[PDB]
Design a protein around this nucleic acid. Structure first.
Ligand SMILES: [Mg+2]
Ligand SMILES: [Mg+2]
Ligand SMILES: [Mg+2]
Ligand SMILES: [Mg+2]
Ligand SMILES: [Mg+2]
Ligand SMILES: [Mg+2]
Ligand SMILES: [Mg+2]
Ligand SMILES: [Mg+2]
Ligand SMILES: [Mg+2]
Ligand SMILES: [Mg+2]
Ligand SMILES: [Mg+2]
Ligand SMILES: [Mg+2]
Ligand SMILES: [Mg+2]
Ligand SMILES: [Mg+2]
Ligand SMILES: [Mg+2]
Ligand SMILES: [Mg+2]
Ligand SMILES: [Mg+2]
Ligand SMILES: [Mg+2]
Ligand SMILES: [Mg+2]
Ligand SMILES: [Mg+2]
Ligand SMILES: [Mg+2]
Ligand SMILES: [Mg+2]
Ligand SMILES: [Mg+2]
Ligand SMILES: [Mg+2]
Ligand SMILES: [Mg+2]
Ligand SMILES: [Mg+2]
Lengths: 101, 103, 32, 132, 129, 311
RNA sequence: UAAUCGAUAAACCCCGAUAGACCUUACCAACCCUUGCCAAUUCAGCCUAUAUACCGCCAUCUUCAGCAAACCCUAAAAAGGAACAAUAGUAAGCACAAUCAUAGCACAUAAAAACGUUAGGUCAAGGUGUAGCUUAUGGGUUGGAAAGAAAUGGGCUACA
């Protein structure tokens, strides 16, 4: 079990987004070009609009991997602030010390 | 049985479980036995295409893109190009209709 | 049935060469 | 009042491990780090993986070795191999201890796809740093 | 132990630059000692220095719910030692570095740069097209 | 607890040998100095608190002193003051007072201080009270107050300590350059993100060069040039000396001040030993401890706070 | 408005968010699916009701000096227990202090700051006791929200 249903949803959006990556890339290339004819670009427009939009990149949300919390995650540890702190304060996180200066 | 720790590590490494030393981070990845001119120089795959058209503009761009791309094998770079051949060749109609004659 | 065996430090020869004892990367056993 | 990873003052009779008696602000001053790996240094990658990994090995060792675990479990990562040190209390008859040694090493090695090394240091009773 | 000798003219290194990143300054001190003592025995002619320490700090909230007046801050320090070796052979480097890396402690990382000596490529020597 | 001290000192020596033989030194001339280096290299703990770093030491420095057995196996106590609960203190007191009495029948600023309270507490292996300490020291003043015999002086010497005091601005010997055969002095000031180095040549045209350009051009702010003028106008040397300068970090005033410090430092080779104490009391050679204060989180300016609301 | 929740004297009000176009999302509107993530389970799954059942993390008095076992005394003890030319107090522990960090001093700042107090904050970080939901308070797809008569908190930019 992933910890939440929200997680299942986003796991799947990751798998989707890896699936169609190159269709996206390829099609969008024409679409982003000023050298090509506009005519090509309209059809291609309809084409990326075609492919399932649960497979689009921006629809992805980094979460805390243990705790699932949608905000507060620190990119490097893929952890929520609460969980991160929790670990770092038993000393279980290497090289992280409470900062004084 | 293991007579010593050195013995241990030794058997691990012959086995492939330990790493080789000193480390080269490319160990275990041969990249198909390809060489630099099979990445950088993409003339091979542009042979079928209109040579004076904006199609050349575009595909010279894609060329430059895939020439600079470390994260892909030769087989994938190829696949991109062939996908563009297939794509442009699939729409002859739109090529003709935009004010340029395209092959 | 409870087992207490004295540490290797008890049988240790005062001049015994060290790298014999600790050849490679080790956890630091307090016993040995 | 900071409640973080702290152990409250009792009527004064409560036994305390050296680690659990030294509060979060003390890390790197008196207390050390429970884990070691490259991942948090300036130029380094995959810190997250070693964190998930670490967490799972905490839970795993707590569950494979019931009631016999002494103090929090000390992980080291060296050149792709894990060195897992444990302070373990003496409860089990030694056969069972070696059963679980082999069991753990094998199982983990095949899970994390890297060679694991296990070390048990056995202790008569939980070390008491304070009170008691 | 098995040694072989192949006819081919082994690689020269002008300068072998070895950086060790770490957390604890102690570990990097003792490791310097070890590296210098290994190098002194292998006739390697080395120097060592201490590059400026990096300290990366960042900030989290101090509570679960809401007091944003209240934060905690955390640090990671990254300390450096660099062993700069001069005039090494190919094999010399391979062995010395093998001995170094094998004994690398768990808290530290190592970043190697070799500067290799090659005379001139073949098509450039003195042909002109 | 004494059995522990016997055992521990034995094992300490056995482990001492064991240390020398692995570390590969002669077990004879092995010192604590060597012990430290040894462990420090074997168990390298980066840790800030230095007591929590690994130690192998003679148990006497490790363990606290103990109060010895205070009574025979009959129950009967050795010292007659035992029932005072502080014998250690009141023995010193009885003796001190006795010394005094004998002195009265007989009689018909070196940097020396009395012990701290902690040092008398160490000397008697006894917890003390402030009042008690004070009482005693008071008594030692009474002792010093009279004619001082030989054993009298020894007695008070037990409770004597001596302290160092050192004040001089450290004087660099000059340096005569080989090229012109001329003497120079090279100073380094540091102020507030800005370090400067100033080489001062003893025979000048008045020339002052900064980072390869002239000082007027590098300090268009008049104030700065005044700051620069300070040491030289102080020592009346204004035209006499020729300075080369390299400064980096921070903004203009910080720079001018760094040059102030560096210069005033490089100017004490060419000055008299007396003018030095003047430059100190002018405050020229003392660094500026003043620096930016870190913002604090949940605040504004390290001091400035977010506007506070009563309602 | 068909259309979230939580905070809301000092100790809310650029607050959970170091962050909502879809997503996030918990909301409303329609449609749909019923061992419906997992190795097995008359079992799953629930941002549903309890923060006045809680653990976690914190706020607050607070840069406040006290808290507390083990004892000892008081022509009785609810409780109290010091005077230093000392009159019944001794006591390890936790606080403060001390040391650490801000790369040498020093000061400064940072940190720390017990016991309790406010049934202070949070069952929407996560986890749980008690209760409820189970062809639905569960799970999905598609759209839709976040309009200003004002009233006010904090900011930014000005008035030269
Ligand atoms: Mg997003
Ligand atoms: Mg606070
Ligand atoms: Mg300001
Ligand atoms: Mg409310
Ligand atoms: Mg409420
Ligand atoms: Mg409130
Ligand atoms: Mg605010
Ligand atoms: Mg939405
Ligand atoms: Mg719901
Ligand atoms: Mg209610
Ligand atoms: Mg409450
Ligand atoms: Mg609570
Ligand atoms: Mg007090
Ligand atoms: Mg009382
Ligand atoms: Mg210091
Ligand atoms: Mg201070
Ligand atoms: Mg504070
Ligand atoms: Mg303090
Ligand atoms: Mg309430
Ligand atoms: Mg309230
Ligand atoms: Mg819940
Ligand atoms: Mg429950
Ligand atoms: Mg629904
Ligand atoms: Mg929606
Ligand atoms: Mg108004
Ligand atoms: Mg303003």
């Amino acid at each position: 079990y992933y910890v939440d249903w929200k997680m299942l949803r986003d796991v799947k959006r990751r798998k989707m987004a890896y699936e169609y990556a190159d269709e996206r890339l390829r099609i969008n290339s024409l679409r982003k070009n000023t050298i090509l004819p506009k005519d090509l670009q309209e059809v291609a427009d309809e084409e990326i609009a075609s492919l399932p939009r649960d497979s689009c990149p921006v629809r992805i949300r980094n979460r805390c991997v243990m705790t699932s919390r949608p905000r507060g995650v620190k990119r490097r540890w893929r952890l929520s602030r609460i969980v991160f702190r929790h670990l770092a304060d038993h000393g279980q996180l290497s090289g992280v010390q409470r900062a004084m200066w | 049985p293991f007579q010593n720790g050195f013995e241990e590590m030794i058997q691990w490494t012959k086995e492939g479980k330990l790493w080789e030393f000193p480390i080269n981070n490319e160990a275990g990845f041969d990249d198909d036995g390809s060489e630099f001119h099979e990445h950088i120089f993409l003339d091979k795959y542009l042979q079928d295409f209109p040579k004076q058209g904006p199609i050349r503009h575009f595909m010279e761009l894609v060329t430059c893109g895939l020439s600079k791309n470390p994260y892909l094998s030769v087989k994938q770079k190829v696949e991109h190009i062939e996908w563009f051949r297939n794509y442009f060749n699939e729409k002859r109609v739109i090529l003709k209709e935009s004010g340029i004659q395209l092959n | 049935r409870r087992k207490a065996l004295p540490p290797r430090t008890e049988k240790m020869a005062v001049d015994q060469d060290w790298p014999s004892v600790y050849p490679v990367a080790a956890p630091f056993k307090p016993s040995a | 009042k900071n409640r973080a990873a702290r152990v409250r003052v009792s009527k004064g009779d409560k036994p305390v491990t050296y680690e659990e008696a030294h509060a979060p602000h003390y890390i790197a001053h008196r207390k050390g780090w429970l884990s070691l790996h490259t991942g948090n240094l300036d130029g380094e990658d995959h810190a997250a993986e070693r964190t998930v990994e670490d967490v799972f090995l905490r839970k795993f060792m707590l569950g494979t070795f019931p009631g016999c675990l002494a103090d929090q479990l000390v992980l080291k990562r060296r050149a792709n191999q894990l060195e897992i040190c444990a302070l373990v209390l003496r409860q089990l008859p030694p056969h069972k201890f070696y059963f679980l040694v082999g069991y753990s090493e094998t199982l983990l090695s095949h899970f994390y796809k890297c060679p694991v090394h296990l070390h048990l240091q056995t202790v008569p009773s939980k070390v008491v740093y304070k009170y008691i | 132990p098995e040694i072989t000798i192949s006819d081919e003219p082994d690689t020269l290194y002008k300068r072998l630059s070895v950086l060790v990143k770490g957390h604890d300054k102690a570990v990097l001190d003792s490791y310097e000692y070890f590296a210098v003592l290994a190098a002194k025995e292998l006739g390697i002619s080395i120097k060592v220095h201490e590059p400026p320490r990096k300290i990366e700090r960042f900030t989290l909230l101090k509570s679960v719910h809401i007091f944003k007046k209240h934060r905690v801050q955390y640090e990671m320090r990254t300390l450096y030692r660099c062993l700069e070796l001069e005039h090494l052979t190919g094999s010399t480097a391979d062995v010395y570095l093998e001995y170094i890396q094998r004994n690398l402690p768990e808290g530290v990382a190592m970043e190697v740069t070799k500067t290799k000596l090659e005379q001139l490529p073949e098509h450039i020597r003195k042909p002109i097209w | 607890t004494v059995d522990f001290i016997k055992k521990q000192i034995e094992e300490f020596n056995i482990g001492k040998r064991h240390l020398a033989n692995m570390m590969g030194e002669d077990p004879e001339t092995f010192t604590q100095e060597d012990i430290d280096r040894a462990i420090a290299y074997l168990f390298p703990s980066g840790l800030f608190e230095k007591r929590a770093r690994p130690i192998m030491k003679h148990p006497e420095e490790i363990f606290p002193k103990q109060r010895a057995i205070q009574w025979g196996e009959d129950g009967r106590p050795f010292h007659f003051l035992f029932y005072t609960g502080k014998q250690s203190y009141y023995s010193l007191m009885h003796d001190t007072y006795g010394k005094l009495l004998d002195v009265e029948k007989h009689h018909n600023p070196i940097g020396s201080r009395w012990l701290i309270k902690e040092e008398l507490e160490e000397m008697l292996v006894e917890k003390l009270s402030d009042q008690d300490y004070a009482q005693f020291i008071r008594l030692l003043e009474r002792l010093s107050a009279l004619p001082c015999g030989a054993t009298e002086e020894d007695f008070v010497n037990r409770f004597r300590r001596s302290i160092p005091x050192x004040x001089x601005x450290x004087x660099x010997x000059x340096x005569x350059x080989x090229x012109x055969g001329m003497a120079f002095s090279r100073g380094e000031g540091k102020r507030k993100t800005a370090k400067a180095e100033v080489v001062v040549y003893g025979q000048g045209s008045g020339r002052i060069d900064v980072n390869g350009v002239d000082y007027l051009l590098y300090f268009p702010v008049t104030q700065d040039r005044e700051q620069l003028m300070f040491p030289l106008h102080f020592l009346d040397r204004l035209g006499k000396h020729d300075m080369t300068c390299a400064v980096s970090g921070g903004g203009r005033s910080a720079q001018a001040g760094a040059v102030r410090l560096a210069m005033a430092r490089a100017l004490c080779s060419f000055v008299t030993e007396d003018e030095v104490e003047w430059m100190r009391q002018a405050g020229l050679l003392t660094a500026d401890p003043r620096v930016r204060e870190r913002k604090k989180p949940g605040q504004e300016g390290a001091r400035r706070k977010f506007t506070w609301k009563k309602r």
